[PDB]
Structure formats: C-alpha cells, structure tokens
Amino acid sequence: KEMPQPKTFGELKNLPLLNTDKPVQALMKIADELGEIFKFEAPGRVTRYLSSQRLIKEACDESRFDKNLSQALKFVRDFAGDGLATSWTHEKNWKKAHNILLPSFSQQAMKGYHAMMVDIAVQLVQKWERLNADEHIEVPEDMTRLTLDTIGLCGFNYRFNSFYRDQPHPFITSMVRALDEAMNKLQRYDENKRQFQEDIKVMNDLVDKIIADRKASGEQSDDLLTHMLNGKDPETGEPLDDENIRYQIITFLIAGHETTSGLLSFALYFLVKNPHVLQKAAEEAARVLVDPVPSYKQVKQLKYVGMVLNEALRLWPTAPAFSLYAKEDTVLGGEYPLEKGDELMVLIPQLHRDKTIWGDDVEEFRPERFENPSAIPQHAFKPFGNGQRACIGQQFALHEATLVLGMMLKHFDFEDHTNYELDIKETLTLKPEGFVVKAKSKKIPL
C-alpha cells in the first residue's frame, strides 16, 4: 500500500539524489534499499521507479501504460524533436515514422546494412591491428567511433570518419555536448543555453544539408535516409517530411550510438573479466566467422556472442530506464493504486537483477542465461524497452554488436592489462569509463 520513498531534501524532494554523477547507480542502490517500487518526487514531478519483474511486467502492459517522455527524453526532444524516441505515441509523426521505419530496421533490413556495418567494423579491426606493441585500446572510445560511424553510414550514408580523428566530427561533438546539456539539466547556465542552441544548429544544419544534398542528387543508397525519403506511411499514405527525417537521423545517432557502444564496451568488459566466457565466445567466432569478412548469415550464427550481448545488456542495459504513464486509473501489482497519467520509471538494470527471475547469481556474467528465451519470464529482460515503443534499432544494434564483437573475438586475444575496475560513467547512457584493453592480434587477414 504505502510506497517507499528515498530521503528528501525539503522542498527539493528527491531531486538532489540525482545530483550525482552516477544517478542510475544511485537509483539502483535506492532500489536495493527500498525494493521493487519507490516514489521519486522532484519539483513539478512525481514518478515511481520500478525494479521488479513482478511490477514491470504490468507496467509493460500497453493497454494500461504508454511510453512517457522522461525528463531526459523531454530535454533530448529539444534536438531529437518528434523523432521516434522523443515523440509521444499519439503524435502523428510517431506512428508515421514508426510505420515507415519499421521495415528498414527489421532483421531482414540488416542484410542491407550489413556491408556498411562491416565497413566500419573492418576499420575498427584494422585500427587495432595497427596498434604497436604495448599500446592499448580505449574500449568505449573505439566502440563509440565504431557505432557513430556505423549509424552515420547506415543512417544517412555519411562518413563521420571517427577512426581518422582524435577530435570527433563537429556534429558528434555538438550531439554529445547536446546530450550532456540534456543530462546536466536533469541534475540541476546562460552560456549552456547558447551552447545548446549552437549545438542544435550544428546538428540540424549538417543533417538538413545531407537531406537536401540527397534530394538534390537523387542518389539511392542502402541507408535509412533513402528509405525515409522514399517511404510512405501505409496508414496515412504520407511520407515523413524533411524536418522529421532530420529528427529521425539525429535520433538514430542519439539513441543508437552510445547505447550500442556501451553495449560493446560492457560486453568486452565482461568477456575479459570472464575468460571462460571469452574463450567460448572466441571459439564461436573462430568457428563461425570463417571468411575474411563476416557475412550477414554468419553474424546470425554467432549465437553465443548474441547471448554474451544479451547478458551484458542484462547487467548494464545501456539505455538504463524508460518511462511510462498510466493510460487510465489502474492498480499496480494489486497494491499500488495509480491515477491516470501517473508516471513510472522502469529501472532496467535493477529489473535485470531481480533474483526471483535470474536466481541468486544475478551479478554473475553468464550468457547461458539466454540460451532459451522461453525460459525467461515475460518482461524480465527489457534492455530495448517495451512494446510498440521498444527500441526500433534493436536488430540494428544487436547485428552491429554481434558482428563487431564476433570480429573482435575472431581477430584478437584481449588482455585486461590494467585489471580494469568497472567504473560506469553515466550520461543518458552507461559505459565502462576508462575501460582499456590490450589486443594481441591473432594475425587473421581481412
């Protein structure tokens, strides 16, 4: 009945609890203390953080709960606009882009992105092949170069050329700074706003220019931009307009780059921390990736790598939360009455540590947990969100992560040469900050 609430700060309610550089980890510790549900109040904001599969399975009932824009998403909406991730389900552009983009994010569509993914993946492999002895890999840094470039290439046939750079492409700098400013707005500035508007303008100008260039040239590529320029929503018969296409492209970059790079970085982290798991994954990569360049079909065959990725997503879902609102008055879990519009936050990493689901060894990295999706209770594993508002890029992210992880495991032995201590940097996403490895090439050509 009575819902726990973490410590309050007078008028600020719980908001100062998020004024910490690891808020998800803070919320997880709160969930450790308070359990499956706690109220979290901020000025002009009430939400409830859910951590148990028992409650989250109800929160994932789309007849009762719809996606809410968290404050994070609301701030990201200032530059992702009514792209898929930052639009309400009832916004015309959400359903329109969803209908248009769903076929281009399907598992089948991954066949068409595969070559571009391989392009960037090979650049990552070659970068690491070209390291000198006793040089090391900055893992999240390289993973992010890889995911940004892959989304740039598959998203709008644009090469950020992150592997040619120490300083990222200015758009990436603007996007990352915009995300940081969105994230900074949660925990709490006149310079920030001018910087924020400048970064939005940088993002809009580049993306609008690429769209305009593509419309002017009429060139067809295997990228999402082409699909969006040619796509018509079957429902309305309407295409996305150019502004929404821009917001989608920006959204793919926001939604996909750091989540996926975090996933790769955590996966490699857990792999090097779990040599038997790494050996099994590496054995699979060697057995499956028999060609110099992985095929799409081979990536699908990287089953254990897929389980590795799911288990990394289990422990550290890199988009660590999503928000829901009660569509109508409803009772959560038979004991928490919710009024229409009441907000829920799904604390995914805590969900993924529900011992009633995963057993006592929830902290252990055991990809074998995912051998059979049917053995996993409903809504126990939500790294890609829920229902129609689930990650549209899930197949993309998993394909890219499996491909890249498979190639990494094929081509290198990895050494946790610093005995890296997991330090999870929090933006709107999670990544193992300062995770570094040494990769001894297995000298397998590409």
363 binds, among a second copy, ligand HEM, none (CB under 5 to 8 A by kind): none
- Residues 81-120 binding a second copy (CB under 8 A) are 98, 102-103, 106-108
Tell me the C-alpha distance between 191 and 188, whole Å.
15
The total of other beta-carbon atoms located within 10 Å of residue 371's CB is 13
Q: Does the annotation count 259 as an active-site position?
A: yes
Q: Is 412 known to be catalytic?
A: no
Q: Which residues pair with 343 in a beta bridge?
A: 325
Catalytic position from the list 391, 402, 414, 435: 391
HEC assignment per residue over 364-406: CCCHHHHCCHHHCCCCCCCCCCCHHHCCCCHHHHHHHHHHHHH
The site partner of 347 among ligand HEM, a second copy, none (C-beta below 5 to 8 Å per kind) is none
CA 36/CA 69 separation, integer angstroms:
21
Residue among 259, 318, 330, 429 flagged as catalytic: 259
| Contact status: 146 vs ligand HEM (CB under 6 A) | no
Among 194, 360, 419, 445, binds a second copy (CB under 8 A): 360
H or E element that contains 65: strand 65-68
d(CA 114, CA 222): 10
Of 131 and 186, which CB lies nearer to ligand HEM in the complex structure?
A: 186
129: nearest Cα among 401, 436, 408: 408
State the catalytic residue, choosing from 252, 384, 396, 435. Answer: 384
Q: Which stretch binds a second copy (CB under 8 A): 70-78, 144-152, 295-303, 437-445?
A: 295-303
Catalytic residue check, 60: no
**Least CB distance from residue 368 to a second copy, whole Å?**
4
How many of the chain's residues bind ligand HEM (CB under 6 A)? Answer: 26
Annotated binding residues for (9Z)-hexadecenoate, as ranges?
49
Strand-pair category, 137-138 with 436-441: antiparallel
Q: Shortest approach of ligand HEM to residue 203 CB, angstroms?
A: 16
Q: Which positions from 201 to 230 touch a second copy by CB under 8 A, shown as an x/- string?
A: ------------------------------
Picked from a second copy, ligand HEM, none, the partner binding residue 217 (CB below 5 to 8 A depending on kind) is none
HEC profile of 156-209:
HCCCCCHHHCCCCCHHHHHHHHHHHHHHHHHHCCHHHHHHHHHHHHHHHHHHHH
Question: Which amino acid makes up residue 133?
Answer: A
Per the document, the length of the chain is 446
Where does this chain touch a second copy (CB under 8 A) — which range of 161-169, 253-261, 318-326, 385-393? 385-393
Q: Which does 112 bind (CB under 5 to 8 A by kind): a second copy, ligand HEM, none?
A: none
Does 337 interact with a second copy (rule: CB under 8 A)? no
Residue (229 or 438) nearer to ligand HEM, CB:
229
Distances from the Cα of 73 to the Cα of 47, 76, 185, 257, 416, angstroms: 14, 5, 11, 16, 35
In the chain, the largest separation of any two C-alpha atoms, in whole Å, equals: 62
CB 361 within 8 A of CB 352: no
- Stretch of 117-125, 166-174, 182-190, 390-398 lying at the interface with ligand HEM (CB under 6 A): 390-398
- Taking the complex as a whole, the smallest distance from the CB of residue 43 to a second copy amounts, in Å, to 36
Angle at 305 between CA 225 and CA 408, to 5 degrees: 75
Sketch the per residue contact string, 236 through 275, with ligand HEM: x for CB under 6 A, - otherwise.
---------------xx--xx--xx--x------------
Binding site, annotated residues:
49, 391
Q: Checking DSSP bridges between strand 430-432 and strand 137-138, what pairing results, if any?
A: unpaired
User: Residues annotated as binding site for heme?
Assistant: 391
Should residue 277 be labelled a site residue for a second copy when binding is judged by CB under 8 A? yes
Residue from 391, 407, 424, 430 binding ligand HEM (CB under 6 A) = 391
Q: Which is nearer to a second copy, 215 or 297 (CB)?
A: 297
How many CB atoms lie under 10 A from the CB of residue 90?
8
Rounded distance between C-alpha atoms, residue 111 and residue 114, angstroms: 5
Q: What is the DSSP string of 247-277?
A: HHHHHHHHHHHHHHHHHHHHHHHHHHH-HHH
Active-site residue set: 259, 384, 391
Contacts to ligand HEM by CB under 6 A:
67, 73, 84-85, 98, 151, 251-252, 255-256, 259-260, 263, 317-319, 322, 383-385, 389, 391-393, 396-397
Contacts to a second copy by CB under 8 A:
61, 63, 98, 102-103, 106-108, 274, 276-277, 280, 283-284, 300-301, 303-304, 356-357, 359-360, 366-368, 372-375, 377-378, 387-388, 390, 395
